[PDB]
Amino acid sequence: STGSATTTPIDSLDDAYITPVQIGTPAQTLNLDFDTGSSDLWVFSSETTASEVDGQTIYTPSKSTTAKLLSGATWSISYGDGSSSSGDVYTDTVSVGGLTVTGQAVESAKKVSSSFTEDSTIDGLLGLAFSTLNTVSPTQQKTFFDNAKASLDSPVFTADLGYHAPGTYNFGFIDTTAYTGSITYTAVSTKQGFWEWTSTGYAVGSGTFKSTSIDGIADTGTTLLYLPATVVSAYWAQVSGAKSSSSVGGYVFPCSATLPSFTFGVGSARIVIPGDYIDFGPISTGSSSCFGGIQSSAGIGINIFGDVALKAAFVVFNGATTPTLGFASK
Ligand code: NA
């Protein structure tokens, strides 16, 4: 089997991407944030505290003939941005892009933090990191990908995120029309439960490539590119008037600037992030200070290849017995 679904930016900045997901029978379609940095499929639901729901579409298990309470199971998750959610668990039929899993754990939120309530466009998350991070207790649950894997034509999924445009998540196949050149594969460590890999270095603009190992994660659920402070300082030093602002919480730059590209290495291959991808616009409405898309990972404890990086590439998440990542230009 295979599946193919379109993923759509939630706003004009590509802050996140939503993908429609069918849950239950008859289908209830919710727009989920596919997150390769976490391992829970959780949804706004008929159980979510009413004051914490503001425009999201909810999953109502009582209206699904295939829903069953997973008795005694609870979940609770905290993300890198300080957001959180928790609740109880149902099993139900879940389909993405035509690919169906029966008996998927659907984590029903009883509580969500303010950042979720305030984002009306995201109805929940679909985690695609390794199932070792799943938070369900006392019986850990599998991701949608791990439950689909054995049925797939190939044990893979691909992320093809758009810049200010829709893109695609595919399950079970490589679309050889979706990228240019060849795919370069690189090793993955699953020790922390992430798609963790080592970039071979970077360049700023037309500058020389610096060969240096940068360990980080491929995380579709993180907007920005978080790299070591040395690398980030080298990038922003090429933008007149850029500076790190403790008040704003990262590097800002004049909105009048033209940003340089940023290149990262994947083995001997190179992925180029155009400068435009690094512009996240005014820090507040009408400001002439703009927020940068490359930020320091110092204090986060890991480097994160978030959407700024991933949307410059066709990315293969190879879930074979020995996982690997692949990157191609597009
Ligand atoms: Na922000």
CATH of the domain at 212: 2.40.70.10
Is residue 39 located within the same domain as residue 187? Answer: no
Separation of CA 240 and ligand 1 centre (Å): 21
Q: Which of 108, 199, 261, 296 is catalytic?
A: 199
After which residues is the backbone of the chain broken at C–N > 2.5 Å?
none
C-alpha distances (whole Å) from 184 to each of 18, 130, 259, 266, 291 are 27, 21, 27, 7, 31
Pick the closest to residue 220 from 41, 42, 35 (CA basis): 35
Is residue 274 located within the same domain as residue 198? Answer: yes
Question: How was this one solved?
Answer: X-ray
Q: Give the Cα separation of 193 and 128 in Å (integer).
A: 10
Residue at a domain's end among 174, 200, 231:
174
CB 229 within 8 A of CB 236: no
Domains in the chain: how many in total? Answer: 2
Residue at a domain's end among 174, 204, 228:
174
Residue at a domain's end among 174, 208, 233:
174
Q: Give the Cα separation of 198 and 100 in Å (integer).
A: 33
Separation of CA 200 and ligand 1 centre (Å): 28
- The SS3 of residue 322 is coil
Tell me the sheet residues that pair with 42. 107, 125
- Strands ordered across the beta sheet of 196-204: 269-273, 262-266, 196-204, 210-218, 303-305, 225-227, 294-296
Q: Give the Cα separation of 274 and 259 in Å (integer).
A: 8
**284 catalytically annotated:** no
Query: In this structure, what are the phi and psi dihedrals at residue 269, rounded to the nearest 5 degrees?
Result: -90, 165
Query: Which secondary-structure segment (H or E) carries 253?
Result: strand 250-254
Is residue 32 located within the same domain as residue 140? Answer: yes
Q: Which domain holds residue 63?
A: 5-174
- The tokens describing 115, both together, are 């950042």
Please state the separation of Cα 58 from the chain's center in Å. 21
Amino acid, single-letter form, for residue 260: P
